[PDB]
C-alpha cells in the first residue's frame, strides 16, 4: 500500500534540502513555507491530495504535460526540471520547484516525506544478471522459517508478510518504493528482501534506501538496449557494493563463480564471498547430489569451516550458488543455516525451474529463461549424457527482434528436441517470429514448429521417455498469450498434459 499515517514535511524544507528553486519567483517562497507534503508520486494519475507531483522527462513523454491532471487530483506542488517549466509555461495553481536532475534526488525526497522507512527496516538488496528472483525467495523462506516477518519486492510481485500484491516493475520508482517501505513499517515488517535491477540503480529508483546487505549473484550480457555498454551495466550494479558509493550496503555478499563476480568482490573490498564452483570463498558448497523429486542436496561450508547438510527443491548447479548467497545473506542478518534449512528444503520459487510432477516418469520443468544468455545456462545445467532434453519456447512480438535467431541456435545445440511456439506474438504475424528462431536451428537436435502453445507442451510431454527432461521456457511465472490477451499458464498447461498421459 501507501502508508496510512504520514506526518508531512513543510514544502520549504523539501525545497531547501534538494536545493530546488521556485518557477514563479523567489518570493513565492512565503506560501511554500506553508504547504505540507504528505506523499510523492511521479505518475499524475496516482496523486493523492497533499502529494508532491514529480514531473520528470522520459523516453516517451514529459510528466510536465500532466500537471493539470495532478493538480486536479489535489497535488500541492510540482517538482520538475527546466525542460519541465517550459512545458508548464505560465499558470499552475500550485508551487513549482525546479531542479536539474530531479529523478536523481526524488529518492531522498520520497524517503524524507515517508519518514525514512529503511532506517527502521533491515533491507536486503539483491542484484545481478540472473538469480535475483530465486535468491530473494530463498532468503524470504529462510527468514520465515526462522520466524521473522518479511516483505519481498521483485519480478513476481510484492509480499507484505502474507499479503501478495503484484508489481509493475522489478524495482519500483523511488516514491513507490519508499511508500511501500513505509507501509511495511506500519504493518510490523522487520526485514525486507528486494530484487535490485540495474535499471533501478541507473534511474536512481533506490535512492533514499539504506541497505543492511547487498548481494551480487552474477553478470552476463543483458539489458544492452538500455545500458549503452556492458561497462555501464556493471557500473550500475557496482554502485551497491563500492565502499565509497552512496548506495553501499552495510554488508556485501558476492558470488565468485562468474568472472564479473570476482570483479565485484574486489570492488566491495570486504565482500563475503561465495562459491559453488570449487573456488575459494567464505561460503563453499560440495557433495552436490541430484535427489528423487528433482531436488539437490549438498554441504554448505560456512566462513568458519563448518559443514551444513542443505537440501534445495530446485535443479541446476547455479541454484546451489543462489542458495549459498541466500545462506550467507541469512547468516549476516543473524539467521543460522540450522534455522533456515527447513524453509529452504521446501521452497519452490514460481516460474524458476519449477518442476511439475503430477504423475511420474521424467522431469517436467517451467522456466522463465527468455534471453539467449538465460537459455544457454539453463539448458547446460540440465544436460546430462544418457538423458534426453526437450525444450519448448517462443519469442515475444514487438520485443527485441535480434534475440530470436540466436536462441534457436543455442537451443539446437543443447537440446535433443526443440519445439518452437508462440510467446506473446503481439501485433506481429507469429510465423515470422517462429521462422526466425528456426533460422537459428539451421546433428544432435531435432526441431519442430508447433504454433499453438498448449499443443507444443503436449507434443513434448508425449515425446519424453522415463528419465528425460522437458523444459517449458520463456514464460516462467508470466501468464496470458498476447496476440486480445488470451489466458495461458505454463504450469497449468504442463500439469494438464501430464495428466493426459494416462
Ligand X SMILES: CC(=O)N[C@H]1[C@@H](OP(=O)(O)OP(=O)(O)OC[C@H]2O[C@@H](n3ccc(=O)[nH]c3=O)[C@H](O)[C@@H]2O)O[C@H](CO)[C@@H](O)[C@@H]1O[C@H](C)C(=O)N[C@@H](C)C(=O)N[C@H](CCC(=O)O)C(=O)O
How many chain residues are in contact with ligand X, going by CB under 6 A? 21
Breaks in the chain (C to N > 2.5 A) come right after: 442, 483
Q: Which three cell numbers stand for residue 117?
A: 522507512
Q: How far is the CB of 349 from ligand X (least distance, A)?
A: 14
369 binds ligand X (CB under 6 A): no
Between 298 and 318, name the residue whose CB sits nearer to ligand ADP: 318
State which of residues 378, 410, 412, 417 lies at the interface with ligand ADP (CB under 6 A): 378
Q: How far apart are CA 97 and CA 298, in angstroms?
A: 56
Interface segment toward ligand ADP; rule CB under 6 A; list 65-73, 201-209, 279-287, 369-377: 369-377
According to the annotation, is 292 in a ligand binding site?
no
Q: How far is the CB of 59 from ligand X (least distance, A)?
A: 4
**Residue of 341, 343, 342, 368 whose CA lies nearest to 354:** 368
Partner interacting with residue 360 (select from ligand ADP, ligand X, Mg ion, none; CB below 5-8 Å by kind) = none
Q: Which three cell numbers stand for residue 297?
A: 542436496
Binders in 158-197 for ligand ADP, by CB under 6 A:
195
130 binds ligand ADP (CB under 6 A): yes
132 binds Mg ion (CB under 5 A): yes
Q: How far apart are CA 150 and CA 123, in angstroms?
A: 10
| Residues 179 and 151: beta-carbon distance below 8 Å | no
According to the annotation, is 476 in a ligand binding site?
no
Q: How far is the CB of 492 from ligand ADP (least distance, A)?
A: 18
133 binds Mg ion (CB under 5 A): yes
Partner interacting with residue 140 (select from ligand ADP, Mg ion, ligand X, none; CB below 5-8 Å by kind) = none
| Residues 441 and 418: beta-carbon distance below 8 Å | yes
Between 155 and 296, name the residue whose CB sits nearer to Mg ion: 155
**Residue of 37, 91, 89 whose CA lies nearest to 62:** 89
Cα 272 to Cα 139, 264, 268, 487: the distances in Å are 16, 11, 9, 44
State which of residues 121, 203, 300, 392 lies at the interface with ligand X (CB under 6 A): 203
Q: How far apart are CA 358 and CA 281, in angstroms?
A: 39
40 binds ligand X (CB under 6 A): no
Q: How far apart are CA 299 and CA 405, in angstroms?
A: 40
**Residue of 328, 374, 330 whose CA lies nearest to 351:** 374
Strand partners, 10: 36
218 binds ligand ADP (CB under 6 A): yes
Binders in 156-215 for Mg ion, by CB under 5 A:
195
- 428: Cβ contacts below 8 Å, ≥ 6 apart: 397, 398
- 103: Cβ contacts below 8 Å, ≥ 6 apart: 54, 56, 203, 204
SS3 state of residue 362: coil
- Please list the alpha-helical segments (H only) found in 187-258: 198-202, 230-238
According to the annotation, is 275 in a ligand binding site?
no
Q: How far is the CB of 393 from ligand ADP (least distance, A)?
A: 11
131 binds ligand X (CB under 6 A): no
Partner interacting with residue 242 (select from ligand X, Mg ion, ligand ADP, none; CB below 5-8 Å by kind) = none
38 binds ligand X (CB under 6 A): no
Q: How far apart are CA 54 and CA 42, in angstroms?
A: 4
Between 200 and 312, name the residue whose CB sits nearer to Mg ion: 200
Q: How far is the CB of 475 from Mg ion (least distance, A)?
A: 14
399 binds ligand X (CB under 6 A): no
200 binds ligand X (CB under 6 A): yes
Between 134 and 421, name the residue whose CB sits nearer to ligand ADP: 134
Between 117 and 474, name the residue whose CB sits nearer to ligand ADP: 474
Helices (H) and strands (E) in the chain, counts: 16, 25
Between 430 and 474, name the residue whose CB sits nearer to ligand ADP: 474
**Residue of 340, 353, 389 whose CA lies nearest to 130:** 353
Between 131 and 261, name the residue whose CB sits nearer to ligand X: 131
379 binds ligand ADP (CB under 6 A): no
SS3 string of 366-434?
EECCCCHHHHHHHHHHCCCCCCCEEEEEEECCCCCHHHHHHHHHHHHHHCCEEEEEECCCCCCCHHHHH
| Residues 450 and 421: beta-carbon distance below 8 Å | yes
State which of residues 170, 218, 319, 481 lies at the interface with ligand X (CB under 6 A): 170
475 binds ligand ADP (CB under 6 A): no
127 binds Mg ion (CB under 5 A): no
209 binds ligand X (CB under 6 A): no
DSSP state of 47: P
- Taking the CA atoms of residue 84, residue 85, residue 89 and residue 94 in that order, the dihedral angle to the nearest 10 degrees is 110
State which of residues 44, 160, 271, 472 lies at the interface with ligand X (CB under 6 A): 44
Chain residues that interact with ligand X, rule: CB under 6 A: 42-45, 56, 58-61, 63, 66, 155, 169-171, 173, 197, 199-200, 203, 226
Annotated binding site for meso-2,6-diaminopimelate, which residues?
A: 399, 423-426, 474, 478
Provide the annotated binding site: 42, 128-134, 170-171, 197, 205, 399, 423-426, 474, 478
Residues that bind Mg ion (CB under 5 A): 132-133, 155, 195, 222
Amino acid at each position: 500500500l501507501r502508508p496510512n499515517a504520514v506526518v508531512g514535511v513543510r514544502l520549504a524544507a523539501l525545497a531547501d534540502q534538494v536545493g530546488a528553486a521556485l518557477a514563479e519567483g523567489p518570493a513565492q517562497r512565503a506560501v511554500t513555507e506553508d504547504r505540507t507534503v504528505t506523499g510523492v508520486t511521479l505518475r499524475a494519475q496516482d496523486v493523492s491530495p497533499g502529494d508532491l507531483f514529480a514531473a520528470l522527462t522520459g523516453s516517451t513523454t514529459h510528466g510536465a504535460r500532466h500537471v493539470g491532471d495532478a493538480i486536479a487530483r489535489g497535488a500541492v506542488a510540482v517538482l520538475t526540471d527546466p525542460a519541465g517549466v517550459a512545458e508548464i509555461a505560465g499558470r499552475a495553481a500550485v508551487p513549482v520547484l525546479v531542479h536539474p536532475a530531479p529523478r536523481g534526488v526524488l529518492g531522498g525526497l520520497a524517503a524524507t516525506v515517508y519518514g525514512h522507512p529503511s532506517e527502521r527496516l533491515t533491507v536486503i538488496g539483491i542484484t545481478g544478471t540472473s538469480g535475483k528472483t530465486t535468491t530473494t525467495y530463498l532468503v524470504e523462506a529462510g527468514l520465515r522459517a526462522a520466524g521473522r516477518v518479511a516483505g519481498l519486492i521483485g519480478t513476481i510481485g510484492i509480499r507484505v508478510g502474507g499479503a501478495d500484491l503484484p508489481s509493475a516493475l522489478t524495482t519500483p520508482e523511488a516514491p513507490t518504493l519508499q511508500a511501500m517501505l513505509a507501509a511495511m513499517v506500519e504493518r510490523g515488517v522487520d526485514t525486507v528482501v528486494m530484487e535490485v535491477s540495474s535499471h533501478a540503480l541507473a534511474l536512481g529508483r533506490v535512492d533514499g534506501t539504506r541497505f543492511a546487505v547487498g548481494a551480487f549473484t552474477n553478470l552476463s550480457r543483458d539489458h544492452l538496449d538500455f545500458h549503452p555498454s556492458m561497462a555501464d551495466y556493471f557500473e550500475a550494479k557496482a554502485s551497491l557494493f563500492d565502499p565509497d558509493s552512496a548506495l553501499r550496503a552495510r554488508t556485501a555478499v558476492v558470488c565468485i563463480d562468474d568472472d564479473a563476480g570476482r570483479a565485484m568482490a574486489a570492488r566491495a573490498a570486504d565482500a563475503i564471498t561465495v562459491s559453488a564452483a570449487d573456488r575459494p570463498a567464505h561460503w563453499r558448497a560440495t557433495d552436490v547430489a541430484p535427489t528423487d523429486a528433482g531436488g539437490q542436496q549438498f554441504t554448505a561450508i560456512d566462513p568458519a569451516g563448518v559443514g551444513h547438510h542443505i537440501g534445495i527443491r530446485l535443479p541446476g548447479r547455479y541454484n546451489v550458488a543462489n542458495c549459498l548467497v541466500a545462506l550467507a545473506i541469512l547468516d549476516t542478518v543473524g539467521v543460522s543455516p540450522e534455522q533456515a534449512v527447513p524453509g529452504l528444503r521446501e521452497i519452490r520459487v514460481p516460474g524458476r525451474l519449477e518442476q511439475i510432477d503430477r504423475g511420474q516418469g521424467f522431469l517436467a520443468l517451467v522456466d522463465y529463461a527468455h534471453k539467449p544468455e538465460a537459455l544457454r545456462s539453463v539448458l547446460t545445467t540440465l544436460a546430462h549424457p544418457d538423458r534426453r532434453l526437450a525444450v519448448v519456447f517462443g519469442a515475444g512480438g514487438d520485443r527485441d527482434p535480434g534475440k530470436r535467431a540466436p536462441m534457436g541456435r543455442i537451443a539446437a545445440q543443447l537440446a535433443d528436441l526443440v519445439v518452437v511456439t508462440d510467446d506473446n506474438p503481439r501485433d506481429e504475424d507469429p510465423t515470422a517470429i517462429r521462422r526466425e528462431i528456426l533460422a537459428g536451428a539451421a546433428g544432435d537436435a531435432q526441431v519442430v514448429e508447433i504454433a499453438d502453445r498448449r499443443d507444443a507442451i503436449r507434443h513434448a510431454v508425449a515425446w519424453a521417455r522415463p528419465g528425460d527432461v522437458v523444459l517449458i521456457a520463456g514464460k516462467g511465472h508470466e501468464t496470458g498469450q498476447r496476440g486480445r490477451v488470451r489466458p495461458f499458464d505454463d504450469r497449468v498447461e504442463l500439469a494438464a498434459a501430464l495428466e493426459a498421459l494416462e
